[PDB]
């Protein structure tokens, strides 16, 4: 048996948290980076039941974006695979967050994702160095409309944006400039979103359209693929 992909484990934990219903994730990776994501979810008010072997986690979904009141620091050690999807998702609801981690987290570049979120109206501030964590993020919701993303962008940034786009105020259209790289990785993300009940119209990787009014819905069990 092969363990779950770290990035798939954290992305599926975040969708399970946003989704209606409880999702039993299986083959979850037993890793501290998954624990940093669980800890963020706990601080954000999400309940879950984690099995003794740490590879099974039932996440009780909020059925909508996070809404916290007290300003919160979310310290994520060196978990890039938790920082990136959260930088986007934290813009969707209500709250005031500092997204940060250990000194090495501050060396993880994040500017291309911040730029995409800001095209959709996000309120994000760099607290130390431009283009890097720590970030101060305000929950504002994301605006409907067209955003333009470069085809050479690292897939993890495009993925983080796509995962949050269904919870924007209306239809989101992502235009890609040039030839999109890492198409198979984008495919994995689109597949996970589909399992959580969301449709993304893919125009041969030149444009992605996320119709308005969708919600993530628990598929019951989500099996985390290897890699
Ligand atoms: Cl990483
Ligand atoms: Cl990532
Ligand atoms: Cl990715």
């Amino acid at each position: 048996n092969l363990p779950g992909s770290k990035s798939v484990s954290n992305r599926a934990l975040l969708l399970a948290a946003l989704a209606s219903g409880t999702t039993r994730l299986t083959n979850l990776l037993d890793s501290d980076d998954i624990r940093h994501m669980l800890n963020a979810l706990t601080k954000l008010g999400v309940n879950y039941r984690l099995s003794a072997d740490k590879t099974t986690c039932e996440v009780e979904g909020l059925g909508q974006a996070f809404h916290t009141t007290q300003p919160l620091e979310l310290f994520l050690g060196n978990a890039g695979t938790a920082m990136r999807p959260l930088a986007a998702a934290l813009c969707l609801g209500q709250g005031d967050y500092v997204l940060t981690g250990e000194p090495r987290m501050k060396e993880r570049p994040i500017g291309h994702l911040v730029d995409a979120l800001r095209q959709a109206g996000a309120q994000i501030e760099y607290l130390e160095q431009e283009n890097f964590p720590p970030l101060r993020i305000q929950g504002t919701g994301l605006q409907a409309g067209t955003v333009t993303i470069d085809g050479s962008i690292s897939s993890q940034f495009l993925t983080a944006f796509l995962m949050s786009a269904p919870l924007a105020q209306g239809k989101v259209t992502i235009k890609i400039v040039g030839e999109l790289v890492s198409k198979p990785y984008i495919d994995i993300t689109l597949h996970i979103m589909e399992q959580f009940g969301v449709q993304v119209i893919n125009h041969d990787y030149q444009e992605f359209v996320i119709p308005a009014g969708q919600s993530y819905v628990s598929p019951g069990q989500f099996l985390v693929e290897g890699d």
Side-chain angles (χ1 to χ4, degrees):
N1 294 349
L2 301 172
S5 156
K6 178 179 300 193
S7 59
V8 174
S9 294
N10 273 348
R11 290 162 193 182
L13 280 169
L14 170 64
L15 298 192
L18 294 180
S20 290
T22 295
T23 304
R24 183 172 173 92
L25 290 85
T26 63
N27 202 37
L28 195 66
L29 182 66
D30 175 3
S31 162
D32 289 343
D33 289 354
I34 268 57
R35 282 175 279 279
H36 286 297
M37 173 63 81
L38 290 175
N39 291 345
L41 298 179
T42 292
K43 288 158 211 173
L44 295 163
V46 175
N47 292 314
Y48 59 86
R49 293 178 181 176
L50 182 67
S51 67
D53 74 5
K54 315 286 186 193
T55 71
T56 287
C57 187
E58 296 194 334
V59 175
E60 182 179 26
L62 304 174
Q64 65 176 342
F66 310 107
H67 287 81
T68 53
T69 50
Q70 173 59 44
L72 284 183
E73 165 176 299
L74 292 173
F75 179 89
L76 303 172
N78 198 29
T81 56
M83 185 273 290
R84 294 181 288 264
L86 286 164
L90 294 163
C91 302
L92 299 164
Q94 293 275 106
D96 176 6
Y97 312 97
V98 169
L99 192 64
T100 192
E102 70 184 57
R104 294 173 179 162
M105 174 70 80
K106 303 179 182 188
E107 294 160 357
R108 296 181 177 273
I110 192 73
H112 298 163
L113 174 54
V114 168
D115 293 338
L117 291 163
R118 282 177 174 164
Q119 294 180 47
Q123 193 65 179
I124 297 166
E125 181 199 8
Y126 291 110
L127 298 162
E128 298 171 13
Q129 183 174 345
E130 189 87 8
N131 300 323
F132 295 95
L135 298 183
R136 175 162 179 254
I137 298 170
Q138 305 305 125
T140 49
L142 290 186
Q143 288 170 328
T146 300
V147 303
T148 299
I149 286 176
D150 194 63
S152 278
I153 195 164
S154 295
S155 61
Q156 301 75 21
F157 305 136
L158 180 52
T159 275
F161 186 91
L162 273 162
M163 284 169 52
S164 283
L167 305 188
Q169 298 302 104
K171 178 167 49 184
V172 166
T173 298
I174 299 163
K175 300 194 190 310
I176 301 303
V177 179
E179 313 275 347
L180 186 62
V181 304
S182 303
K183 294 185 184 72
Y185 287 85
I186 301 307
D187 289 343
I188 285 167
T189 299
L190 297 175
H191 184 258
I192 293 169
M193 291 173 61
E194 192 175 37
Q195 300 176 252
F196 284 92
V198 164
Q199 167 182 233
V200 172
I201 308 176
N202 176 2
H203 294 308
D204 191 29
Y205 308 92
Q206 294 169 4
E207 179 181 287
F208 299 98
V209 179
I210 303 87
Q214 303 184 80
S215 267
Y216 288 118
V217 174
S218 176
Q221 183 185 129
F222 181 81
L223 171 272
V224 180
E225 82 183 66
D227 230 29

